[PDB]
Design an enzyme around this catalytic site. Structure first.
Site, short mmCIF file in Angstrom:
data_model
loop_
_atom_site.label_atom_id
_atom_site.label_comp_id
_atom_site.label_asym_id
_atom_site.label_seq_id
_atom_site.Cartn_x
_atom_site.Cartn_y
_atom_site.Cartn_z
N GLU A 11 -28.73 -19.02 8.16
CA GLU A 11 -29.96 -19.69 7.69
C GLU A 11 -30.55 -19.14 6.40
O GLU A 11 -31.30 -19.85 5.73
CB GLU A 11 -31.04 -19.66 8.78
CG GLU A 11 -30.66 -20.43 10.05
CD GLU A 11 -30.53 -21.95 9.87
OE1 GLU A 11 -30.86 -22.51 8.80
OE2 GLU A 11 -30.09 -22.60 10.84
N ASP A 20 -34.07 -27.83 3.33
CA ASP A 20 -32.86 -27.39 4.04
C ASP A 20 -31.68 -28.30 3.69
O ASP A 20 -31.81 -29.17 2.82
CB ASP A 20 -33.12 -27.23 5.55
CG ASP A 20 -33.24 -28.56 6.30
OD1 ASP A 20 -33.09 -29.64 5.70
OD2 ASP A 20 -33.49 -28.55 7.53
N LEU A 32 -37.78 -24.78 10.44
CA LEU A 32 -38.03 -26.17 10.08
C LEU A 32 -39.52 -26.46 10.25
O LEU A 32 -40.07 -26.26 11.34
CB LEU A 32 -37.19 -27.10 10.96
CG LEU A 32 -37.38 -28.61 10.81
CD1 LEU A 32 -37.02 -29.08 9.40
CD2 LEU A 32 -36.57 -29.32 11.89
N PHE A 104 -30.41 -23.88 17.77
CA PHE A 104 -31.33 -23.54 16.69
C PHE A 104 -31.21 -24.56 15.55
O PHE A 104 -32.22 -25.03 15.02
CB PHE A 104 -31.03 -22.11 16.22
CG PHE A 104 -31.99 -21.56 15.20
CD1 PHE A 104 -31.94 -21.97 13.87
CD2 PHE A 104 -32.94 -20.61 15.57
CE1 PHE A 104 -32.83 -21.46 12.91
CE2 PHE A 104 -33.83 -20.07 14.62
CZ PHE A 104 -33.77 -20.51 13.29
N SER A 117 -17.50 -31.66 24.64
CA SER A 117 -17.38 -30.30 24.12
C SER A 117 -17.92 -29.32 25.15
O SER A 117 -17.30 -28.27 25.40
CB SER A 117 -18.17 -30.15 22.82
OG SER A 117 -17.86 -31.18 21.89
N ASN A 132 -12.49 -30.18 19.56
CA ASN A 132 -13.44 -31.25 19.87
C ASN A 132 -14.76 -31.12 19.11
O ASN A 132 -15.32 -32.12 18.66
CB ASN A 132 -13.70 -31.32 21.38
CG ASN A 132 -14.49 -32.54 21.78
OD1 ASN A 132 -15.70 -32.46 21.99
ND2 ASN A 132 -13.82 -33.67 21.88
#
Ligand SMILES: *SCC1=C(c2ccccc2)C(C)(C)N(O)C1(C)C
Ligand SMILES: [Cl-]
Ligand SMILES: [Cl-]
Ligand SMILES: [Cl-]
Ligand SMILES: [Cl-]
Length: 164
Positions: A11, A20, A32, A104, A117, A132
């Site tokens: 990040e 972002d 965010l 996150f 998945s 996948n």
């Protein structure tokens, strides 16, 4: 390595409001603020989040405080989710960090919908799960970060974060 160091790598750290990878106003370590195109709306969220009139600038300590809250929120999101919790509970601590990382970045409901998945991860079909996971908007839009997260799920090691 741990979830904090991992997400810090993925990040970055910025002390002024910035956009972002999705073009959304963000600050600190991937905090965010809002999906709104209004910078004033983002500033309002920031002031609310920090508890003071910031005018879009925070300190490193403030960035880390929001980061700790956001990591905590990601874990809580997983534990309260009927789809995510059994997968999380089934994983070792390194792979748990990979799942937290995904939550996150995309949110609880976002990751919870990756039904196939998640099943492959639950079944410990690591190579299949990895293949996948790459068949996703996530992988296509952020391939370097997705590759790191997927490597973590595939191997159960921190190899993708070693020299970073
Ligand atoms: S993305 C899953 C697929 C495959 C696979 C990759 C790694 C381990 C197990 C399976 C395979 C066989 C290459 N494939 O064609 C899939 C279904 C796309
Ligand atoms: Cl970022
Ligand atoms: Cl496999
Ligand atoms: Cl695809
Ligand atoms: Cl990327």
């Amino acid at each position: 390595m741990n979830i904090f160091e991992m997400l810090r790598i993925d990040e970055g750290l910025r002390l002024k409001i910035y956009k972002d990878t999705e073009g959304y106003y963000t600050i600190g370590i991937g905090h965010l603020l809002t999906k709104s195109p209004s910078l004033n709306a983002a500033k309002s969220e920031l002031d609310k989040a920090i508890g003071r009139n910031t005018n879009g600038v925070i300190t490193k300590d403030e960035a880390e405080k929001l980061f700790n809250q956001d990591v905590d929120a990601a874990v809580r999101g997983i534990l309260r989710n009927a789809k995510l919790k059994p997968v999380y509970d089934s994983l070792d601590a390194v792979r748990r960090a990979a799942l937290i990382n995904m939550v996150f970045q995309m949110g609880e409901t976002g990751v919870a919908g990756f039904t196939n998945s998640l099943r492959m991860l639950q079944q410990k079909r690591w190579d299949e799960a990895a293949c996948n996971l790459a068949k996703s908007r996530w992988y296509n839009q952020t391939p370097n970060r997705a590759k790191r997260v997927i490597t973590t799920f595939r191997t159960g090691t921190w190899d993708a974060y070693k020299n970073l």
